[PDB]
Design a binder for this molecule. Structure first.
Ligand SMILES: Nc1ncnc2c1ncn2[C@@H]1O[C@H](COP(=O)(O)OP(=O)(O)O)[C@@H](O)[C@H]1O
Ligand SMILES: Nc1ncnc2c1ncn2[C@@H]1O[C@H](COP(=O)(O)OP(=O)(O)O)[C@@H](O)[C@H]1O
Ligand SMILES: [Mg+2]
Ligand SMILES: [Mg+2]
Lengths: 802, 802
């Protein structure tokens, strides 16, 4: 800029200069590889690899690495990277966004940093929007990476896990943002370590970040899976349950335990023909629904704990007394209550797993992306991913003529007008490209064109290859191309034979999109490196953008002033007005992302623990130790509840506790009055943990030393998986129900955090307990195989911006 | 923790261990300084200083540095830092929060990192809440710092700028958060570089961060100053103006210029007896009000640009047509319009300067703070200042008994009850400390105590020294102390003679504060390193905390259940309920800070430019270059407006532009038709910039070579200062008026950003222009002294949480 205002430019200027100098240091040694041998150059990779093991940094080997790559390309493709492209690669290396105007060769640039970071062999994900480009780039760019002798994988959904694994095994991988995501997702629902496809997230280079990180980032990734019409279980459970009402079927006033174990419950339960007493098949599976249905009656009371309704069952916020917006009870106790109250029980798809692009890409050791349009939301990138946008210079100065948006009083005037411009160019040789924003628009003008006898091609985003074929030639003399939402993104238009002197491309925007960014990408398609072009925008007072800006008063002045008379008008001020209109739209969306993120941050934290513990359970050599850590943490909880806030030491209630452990961790008489008397809550834990240890021991020598190691893993996964999957579905429900009935004054997100954490807290407890219960009591019958908890088929999708 | 949940603890555990090992590496070399000479030890500082110049890092010299400090203390104070205190210092060094429970010696700990970071001589700010502690700490802690031979300053408001400068000159400075802030503030309204007191922000160690960074952070710092009843000026301006209506007083249809320069305007203006034509006295000052009043009539039209009202004048959002919430016109053009419309013109204090504690402390190369209570809002610290809370272990294990909050159905039951507990302890020797939360509470119980014949002391935050004196002994046998909002914070209570066996302190909380954090600080005062104590909280159903949680339903159950009968009750669940009540309160406040911050972030960005340019103008050796950069950027703007979006090249309007420059940059005929013809907007800029250069030159050889260097600085400061101060006041207005009339759907903050940036944009333009105008046209008369723009006295204050 000029004058004062030029200091906002300072943080960019300073960096840009490092990068300029460096690009030069690179061009200096153009000689060092210029004349060399194909195989000598390949040995460079190795030299670097060695040099790295020794202790150097990617930053140290950067210049040379880039020089090598630079040579490698000319050799392979015949293209020798520009000084600007070198600057871009570096930017990328420094973990930033390389704003390199559409057509500066962002693809080739990726190679440099990609190559250099790939050397540690840690892996690099180069990502794009669609499977066409992904496969396209991999193929063309791979030949340089492979020449320098580096493995190159391509991940698509149509690939077996084994195929996927091989793709990820590569020194470098190409894939869609969606594939990456979903993979990470499925990757964490795996039963055995070897089934995961992904390798640790190292570095990701996102081609066209704005699209990925911004647009495709309005909603999250989900994996659903239904329940097998199970209803019949709860019905039967509820029925059965209210039978054995006696204290030969125990309960807790303190812990709220529905202790079935008694022979009344047991024997009369096995009577239900549960293939007798097979605790490991049954108890994990069937005895779960029972223990719920039991509590549902005993512990849960109609209008003190919950509430019955026409909208079904609600929870009552204790101590405030409220209709709990959207919250269900854990592990399907909600269903057991409905059965007990006869209400229709619901069985929808459960959300098995979820993460947001934002929280995903955040997961890498390093991220970087490239695109032409980004400074627009530099505030966002810098904020969320800590990537600063760097506007890389152009190779050749721009000479394209960007024309001021033309305004109209009607859609029909506007549209009808566009058809003429096309005509004029058409009848001169000028190749035209018209950008619509929706299907209808693109076909409306199609009619207007065929009517006027102008031959044309229409792109409406399907098998991008087909369109790409079409679009590449869209820059020839009789080129008349219609693009619905930049349908041929990434593929560049080269100025046709003789078209050079015909003017240039001359693209034409039928309207403006909700983002400058996107209508600016439209602009982008002309002037491909010094090439000439014209860009014309068309708008009308009856446009959605307009009639959403509350622009009626303005509509009236024109009308009242007979302005629809002079019709094609250019008011810098009205264009500025739409500029703000856009900024607002964008602002709203940024707000939407900002929110989506926040609700998930609550999740990511929860995932950190789970995911990690889960993984822990799969590198399961020495598992027992955790299993005991968990039994002990379950046990401690019992003790501390029978010994509340110092409520009279040996005057606690040292005889329910006694009878409990004795009945839920051990099997009747073993723990009694005497055993634990005159001991602090701490003293007691160890005493009995010890007798649990004694018992745990016993089982290793009675049911298989190392089979148990798997018993443990099975139980723990069964536990974790079952609990977790639930809580998540639960958490997805809450996240969109809390937005209902909330005069609480607080921000919902707040409630969410608080309530979310709470349940989580619970689930941990639940898990630890289930684990302890089974490992101590559960009985081995046949094959102790780690078993799947997902019922039936799954579905991996991204919802619609709703 | 135990069980699964223990992985949230991982990011803390990992760091805590580095710190434990290190503290040990330190204790290893206890011998190395153990036996040494007082003066040999002092030479260590030097050794380090040298060692540093050479190239070592504070991190490298840490152990030794700490060892030295550790020795230095025992020698000086006789206190040899605990392994825990060493861990704390490190934490601080790593730029984090050292959560070291109240009484772990946070003061002594500060020395270590303080010392070590001070060595570069870059400076260290150690900060606290009040001037007592600040002076106290400086004095006691200084003796160790000074022993190791390091300069130690103390900043108070009662100190001359020269005193302040000396305090800041020190290797280390102690001061209140408020003083620091205000200083930075005043520091940027300085006319000559040498008047600033502060030195570049290096490292700040905040004692009791939570108080500073959180509580004292709900509102911002302001500096106001009124206007000298000037009204008489605008009145006269408005009157005068509408006289010379002729084109011997020019205007612009394109630039909206109220060009007075003409002899009609000039001569008939000097007629107003403006001591003739003294352009430099008058034009800067008086001719400003004229040029406004002029535009007010010509350019500003009653109901197209603005609107008249009973609430005075409003702007009309162009192109949407709206009542501009809260926005005034720049440089007092708003006043000129009111005068032209006869409305009462307003003269309130203007907000001269502002920053938020958050955006201030953010300004350091490094920040760190210590306190007992912080994990509470670890999310905040980690977020805003990128400081992770580290809970440092206790030296000696805690044996204090924290009792479950006691609940009552009345304030009177609750209060009356508290007076008895006091009685019981009093009549046993137990020293009591009762925490109230407001003045009234503390005196209510005072009566209840004097009535019951129990002698007591009441603290209600005044001359903290006086209270500190009182409070230190508040731990003796007949100690009965009443603290309004922890009135004796920082000063620690030592267990009196024989009190050891009497139980301990036994503090008693009359109610709970809006933050656990604060009622937890109350708890903190007992058990000072293994010392015993009891902590009792008291609450009632008729408490504000309660009746803000919408806890009426709950009030009723008790009542309906005859619960006010059994009266003193402990429901873990109701205490949990208040826990949430607090979390909510806190959550609301965090939300309040989060917002305050955001509105200021818009500001900080603007400050970055201004502040920087201002400073630039004061290291004013080679200024001209900027002055031309600015004239040129003003000029470019004119050209580009007379040559709009390619609107027919030599068919622009090359003859108004011509006559303009010729009249606003130059003085009549010099620039004409021919001069600029057949030239691109770019070609023209240089042509004429050159003739401006020719003219600029002339003045250096006609009115003083280097006097001009000061002319330049004077003009530029006059400009900057005048414009800026305004815009800021303006910006403070907007920030609290935009919250009115806003159905716009967008979030206000958004509008604020957009509108804020806009005006800023304007002011830059305004500045550049004023500068150019004067430097080229303005005439030297007498003393060209940099002159103050602040009118009359100033006022530096922090508003109340409103
Ligand atoms: N160093 C180079 N030398 C010659 N041509 C290049 C070079 N780099 C890229 N190109 C060409 O320019 C076009 C732009 O590349 P592309 O990968 O599509 O980047 P962008 O995303 O910027 O349009 C490509 O079709 C390619 O053939
Ligand atoms: N290393 C030490 N050895 C003996 N006493 C110490 C040591 N460090 C601090 N103390 C004492 O313990 C008290 C706590 O110190 P203080 O600065 O008030 O810290 P805090 O903020 O944690 O209460 C001080 O009064 C001091 O006299
Ligand atoms: Mg591309
Ligand atoms: Mg202290």
């Amino acid at each position: 800029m000029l004058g004062i205002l030029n200091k906002m430019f300072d943080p960019t200027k300073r960096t840009l200069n490092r990068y300029e100098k460096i690009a030069n240091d690179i061009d200096a040694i153009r000689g060092d590889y210029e004349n060399l041998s194909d195989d000598a150059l390949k040995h460079k990779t190795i030299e670097f690899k060695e040099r790295l093991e020794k202790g150097a940094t990617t930053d140290d080997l950067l210049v040379e690495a880039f020089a090598v790559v630079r040579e490698a390309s000319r050799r392979v493709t015949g293209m020798f990277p520009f000084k600007v492209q070198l600057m871009g690669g570096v930017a990328l290396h420094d973990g930033n966004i390389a704003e390199m105007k559409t057509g500066e060769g962002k693809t080739l640039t990726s190679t440099l940093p990609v190559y250099l970071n790939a050397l540690t062999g840690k892996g690099v994900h180069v990502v794009t929007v669609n499977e066409y480009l992904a496969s396209r780039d991999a193929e063309q760019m791979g030949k340089i990476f492979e020449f320098l002798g580096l493995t190159v994988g391509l991940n698509l959904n149509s690939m077996s896990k084994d195929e996927k694994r091989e793709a990820y095994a590569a020194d470098i991988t190409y894939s869609t943002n969606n594939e990456l995501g979903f993979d990470y997702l499925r990757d964490n629902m795996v039963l055995y370590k070897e089934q995961m496809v992904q390798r640790p997230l190292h570095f990701a280079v996102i081609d066209e970040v704005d699209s990925i990180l911004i647009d495709e980032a309005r909603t999250p990734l989900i994996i659903s899976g239904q329940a097998a019409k199970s209803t019949k279980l709860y019905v039967q459970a509820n029925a059965f349950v209210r039978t054995l009402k006696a204290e030969k079927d125990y309960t807790y006033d303190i812990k709220t335990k529905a202790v079935q174990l008694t022979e009344e419950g047991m024997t009369k339960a096995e009577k239900a023909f549960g293939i007798d007493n097979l605790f490991d098949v049954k108890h994990v599976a069937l005895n779960h629904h029972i223990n719920q249905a039991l509590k549902a009656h005993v512990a849960m009371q109609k209008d003190v704990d919950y509430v019955v309704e026409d909208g079904q069952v609600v929870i009552v916020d204790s101590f405030t007394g409220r209709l709990m917006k959207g919250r269900r009870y854990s592990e399907g106790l909600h269903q057991a209550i409905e059965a007990k109250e006869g209400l229709e029980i619901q069985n929808e798809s459960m959300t098995l797993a979820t993460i947001t692009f934002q929280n995903y890409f955040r997961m890498y050791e390093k991220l970087a992306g490239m695109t032409g349009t980004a400074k627009t939301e530099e505030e966002e990138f810098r904020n969320i991913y800590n990537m600063q946008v760097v506007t890389i210079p152009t190779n050749r100065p721009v000479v394209r003529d960007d024309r001021p948006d033309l305004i109209y009083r009607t859609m029909e005037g506007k549209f009808k007008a566009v058809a003429e411009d096309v005509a004029q160019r058409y009848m001169t040789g000028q190749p035209v490209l018209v950008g619509t924003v929706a299907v209808e628009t693109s076909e409306l003008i199609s009619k207007l064109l065929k009517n006027k006898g102008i031959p044309h091609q229409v792109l409406n985003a399907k098998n991008h290859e087909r369109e790409a074929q079409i679009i590449e030639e869209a820059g020839q003399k009789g080129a008349v191309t219609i693009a619905t939402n930049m349908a041929g993104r990434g593929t560049d238009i080269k100025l046709g034979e003789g078209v050079k002197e015909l003017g240039g491309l001359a693209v034409v925007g039928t309207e403006r999109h909700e983002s400058r960014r996107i209508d600016n990408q439209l602009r982008g398609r002309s002037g491909r490196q010094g090439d000439p072009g014209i860009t014309q925008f068309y708008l009308s007072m009856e446009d959605e953008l307009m009639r959403r800006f509350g622009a009626e008063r303005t509509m009236a002045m024109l009308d009242r002033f007979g302005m629809d008379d002079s019709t094609p008008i250019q008011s810098k001020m009205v264009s500025r007005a739409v500029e703000s209109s856009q900024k607002r739209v964008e602002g709203n969306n940024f707000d939407s992302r900002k929110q989506l993120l926040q609700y998930d941050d609550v999740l990511r934290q929860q995932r950190e623990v789970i995911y990690k513990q889960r993984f822990e359970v799969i590198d399961s050599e020495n598992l027992r130790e955790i299993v005991e850590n968990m039994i002990k943490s379950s046990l401690e909880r019992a003790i501390a509840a029978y010994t509340p806030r110092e409520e009279l030491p040996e005057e606690w209630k040292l005889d329910g506790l006694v009878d409990l452990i004795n009945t839920t961790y051990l099997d009747e008489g073993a723990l009694e009055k005497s055993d634990i008397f005159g001991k602090e809550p701490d003293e007691m834990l160890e005493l009995i943990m010890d007798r649990i240890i004694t018992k745990y021991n016993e089982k290793e020598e009675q049911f298989g030393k190392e089979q148990m190691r798997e018993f443990e893993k099975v139980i723990v996964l069964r536990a974790v998986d079952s609990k977790w999957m639930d809580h998540i579905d639960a958490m997805d429900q809450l996240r969109q129900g809390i937005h209902l009935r909330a005069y609480a004054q607080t921000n919902p997100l707040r409630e969410y955090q608080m309530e979310g954490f709470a349940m989580f807290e619970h689930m941990i407890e639940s898990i630890e307990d289930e684990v302890a219960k089974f490992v101590m009591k559960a009985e081995i019958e046949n094959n102790l195989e780690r078993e799947e908890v997902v019922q039936g088929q799954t579905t991996a999708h991204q919802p619609q911006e709703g």
